[PDB]
């Protein structure tokens, strides 16, 4: 249903923006068979994960020293995450280590969601 082809594009733009906490786990039904049987369940868990990443991307986490540069691709993540969210259902001293763990976690998350959209575009559409 959710126009898998457009989800594939928005998720691919997310992967590329990122290569520069919620998790999709077994019980989420985001495996290939789980997509076939209950795609609504999996895409619900993806959506909530994106919403959560949107909030982190605009917090006291990505503000403060060392300051984020305007040219940075990290500054465009909030955009691409929000588009995909509609497509489905319309920190004191070392912030540095926590920003890193969040970005590496988001690469892992977007990799799984892309497999979901690729597989549903090839089997569910």
């Amino acid at each position: 249903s959710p126009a898998w082809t457009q989800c594939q594009q928005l998720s691919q733009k997310l992967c590329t923006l990122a290569w520069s906490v919620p998790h999709i786990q077994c019980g989420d039904g985001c495996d290939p068979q789980g997509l076939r049987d209950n795609s609504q369940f999996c895409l619900q868990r993806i959506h909530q994960g994106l919403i959560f990443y949107e909030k982190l991307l605009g917090s006291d986490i990505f503000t403060g020293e060392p300051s984020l540069l305007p040219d940075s691709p990290v500054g465009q993540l909030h955009a691409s995450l929000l588009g995909l969210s509609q497509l489905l259902q319309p920190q004191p001293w070392q912030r540095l280590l926590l920003r890193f763990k969040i970005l590496r976690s988001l690469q892992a998350f977007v990799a799984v969601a892309a497999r979901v959209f690729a597989h549903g575009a090839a089997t569910l559409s």
Binding site: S20, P66, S67, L68, L69, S72, V74, Q94, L96, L103
Partner: peptide, 18 residues
Amino acid sequence: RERCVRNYGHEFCQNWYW
């Protein structure tokens, strides 16, 4: 703390102001 390049790389640390 620009020595982060030795912990996360020169690409990641180039995202921030030093």
